[PDB]
Amino acid sequence: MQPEWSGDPEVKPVFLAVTLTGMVAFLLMVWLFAFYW
Amino acid sequence: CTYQPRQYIAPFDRQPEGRVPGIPQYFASTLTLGGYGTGVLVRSNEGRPTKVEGNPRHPASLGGTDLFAQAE
Amino acid sequence: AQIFPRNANLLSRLSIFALVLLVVEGILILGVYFRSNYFRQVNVAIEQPVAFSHQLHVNVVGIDCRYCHTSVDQSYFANIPATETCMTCHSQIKTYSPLLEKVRESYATGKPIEWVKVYDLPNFVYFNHSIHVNKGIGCSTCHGQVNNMPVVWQQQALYMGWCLNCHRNPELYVRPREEVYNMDYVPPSNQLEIGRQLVAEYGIMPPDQLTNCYVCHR
Numbered sequence: 473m474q475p476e477w478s479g480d481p482e483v484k485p486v487f488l489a490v491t492l493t494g495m496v497a498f499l500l501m502v503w504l505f506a507f508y509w
Numbered sequence: 510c511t512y513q514p515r516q517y518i519a520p521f522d523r524q525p526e527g528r529v530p531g532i533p534q535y536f537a538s539t540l541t542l543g544g545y546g547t548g549v550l551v552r553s554n555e556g557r558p559t560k561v562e563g564n565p566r567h568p569a570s571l572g573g574t575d576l577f578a579q580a581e
Numbered sequence: 582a583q584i585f586p587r588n589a590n591l592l593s594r595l596s597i598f599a600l601v602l603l604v605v606e607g608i609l610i611l612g613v614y615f616r617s618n619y620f621r622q623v624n625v626a627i628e629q630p631v632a633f634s635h636q637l638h639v640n641v642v643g644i645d646c647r648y649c650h651t652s653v654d655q656s657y658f659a660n661i662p663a664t665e666t667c668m669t670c671h672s673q674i675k676t677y678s679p680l681l682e683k684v685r686e687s688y689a690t691g692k693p694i695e696w697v698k699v700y701d702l703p704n705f706v707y708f709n710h711s712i713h714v715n716k717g718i719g720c721s722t723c724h725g726q727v728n729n730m731p732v733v734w735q736q737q738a739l740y741m742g743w744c745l746n747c748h749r750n751p752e753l754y755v756r757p758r759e760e761v762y763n764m765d766y767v768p769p770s771n772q773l774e775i776g777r778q779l780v781a782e783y784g785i786m787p788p789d790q791l792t793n794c795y796v797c798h799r
């Protein structure tokens with residue numbers, strides 16, 4: 473069974489955006505809790 | 510809001526001669542229960558008595574102390 | 582289509598995304614506030630009642646640290662100077678000066694000068710300058726260039742982690758004594774080798790012992 477959104481231009485872009493958001497959040501959190509002191 | 514209050518510090522105007530700040534001293538004094546003296550060595554944290562102990566060179570108080578001398 | 586407009590799909594997805602971003606932002610703000618310089622009073626020159634300048638007396642007049650903080654190497658407490666030490670110079674120097682009036686107000690009455698404590702520990706930490714100084718640590722890798730400080734500020738927040746970083750890795754901060762010598766001392770390029778050699782020579786205990794609770798807290 474295909475996903476409902478299969479065959480959409482927006483799928484790769486939304487996945488990318490979610491990954492970029494996540495990476496940014498992770499780096500910022502890491503900096504504050506590990507390197508900011 | 511801040512981690513802690515100003516915590517001002519007040520020093521001396523003339524230092525005591527034999528005192529090193531933050532180092533307790535010990536002085537020899539006598540405490541009497543029935544009118545009979547028992548030698549005691551008492552710790553003076555900063556010029557204030559804080560802990561009574563026994564005087565090893567005093568007969569009837571060789572290090573050991575009675576509860577009444579401790580609770581003075 | 583029954584009860585919602587066309588853009589409700591985008592609005593709902595963006596609302597979820599914004600809610601997650603807001604939660605992350607709130608966590609970040611809380612952490613930053615609790616690790617801020619304003620909260621911990623770092624790099625803030627606390628104004629003093631008598632306006633004493635370490636730069637003038639140390640860097641210009643040239644007075645040793647132990648002339649004022651005389652108990653630093655013998656007890657846990659670095660003796661804050663008495664008015665007697667202040668008056669040994671100012672009975673003759675800069676007498677009849679409006680900014681030395683408070684000092685002259687003391688030494689005539691028994692009232693002390695209420696300095697504001699810059700470096701403050703929460704009375705369950707039990708620090709000791711004596712062992713530290715004697716073991717090859719100076720008030721430059723431990724306090725800052727106080728020699729050039731018109732108004733003393735807190736160089737770093739005294740975190741539990743800060744103390745534990747150097748208690749665990751003391752070979753990056755240990756110096757060859759001369760710790761009271763003017764803090765013009767600069768660590769050499771081969772700090773690691775010299776630090777290891779000094780750790781071996783002074784007999785500094787491994788982190789198995791220096792990170793125990795009753796080392797600091799009692």
Ligand code: HEC
Binds near residue numbers: 703745795797
């Ligand atoms: C042994 C494993 C412990 C435990 C359980 C704790 N510490 Fe420490 N501690 C040290 C310093 C300088 C501070 C002050 C931190 C600051 O001012 O920001 C602390 C503080 C703590 C806390 C916080 C208490 C609070 O109410 O906020 C706690 C929970 C704590 N410690 C636990 C210094 C040291 C040490 C220096 C060598 C070491 C060792 C320890 N602490 C060890 C412990």
Ligand code: HEC
Binds near residue numbers: 648649701727
């Ligand atoms: C040699 C360069 C030093 C170092 C490393 C320090 N002092 Fe002093 N000091 C003096 C007085 C009267 C004060 C209190 C007034 C004020 O804080 O402005 C101080 C204060 C300090 C501090 C901070 C105290 C605190 O509570 O955190 C520190 C870390 C410090 N000193 C280190 C007096 C003198 C003095 C004249 C008698 C001279 C010389 C020194 N200090 C030298 C040093």
Ligand code: HEC
Binds near residue numbers: 644680
């Ligand atoms: C005890 C901790 C103190 C305090 C509170 C101060 N001093 Fe001194 N001081 C000394 C010298 C040679 C000078 C400069 C002389 C000059 O400017 O002509 C000073 C200066 C000061 C000032 C500034 C006064 C002004 O600018 O007019 C202040 C506020 C001050 N001191 C406070 C010499 C000594 C000294 C060695 C002889 C010692 C010890 C102290 N001072 C101690 C203190």
Ligand code: HEC
Binds near residue numbers: 709712751
């Ligand atoms: C690196 C510059 C350090 C900082 C930061 C702190 N301490 Fe320290 N401490 C340091 C050394 C090189 C030593 C000697 C260790 C030895 O075994 O000789 C110490 C030791 C102490 C001790 C005594 C250890 C003991 O076994 O009794 C105490 C109580 C101590 N240090 C306290 C302490 C605190 C509370 C600190 C944070 C404010 C702290 N030290 C930071 C080096 C360094």
Ligand code: HEC
Binds near residue numbers: 653721
């Ligand atoms: C380890 C880092 C050091 C070293 C080697 C020195 N200082 Fe000290 N100092 C330090 C702490 C963590 C504190 C706070 C103490 C507290 O109870 O909160 C202090 C404090 C002082 C003070 C204030 C008076 C006092 O607390 O006794 C003075 C003055 C002071 N330190 C001066 C000082 C001098 C002259 C040193 C020799 C170079 C020195 N410190 C070393 C941390 C450390």
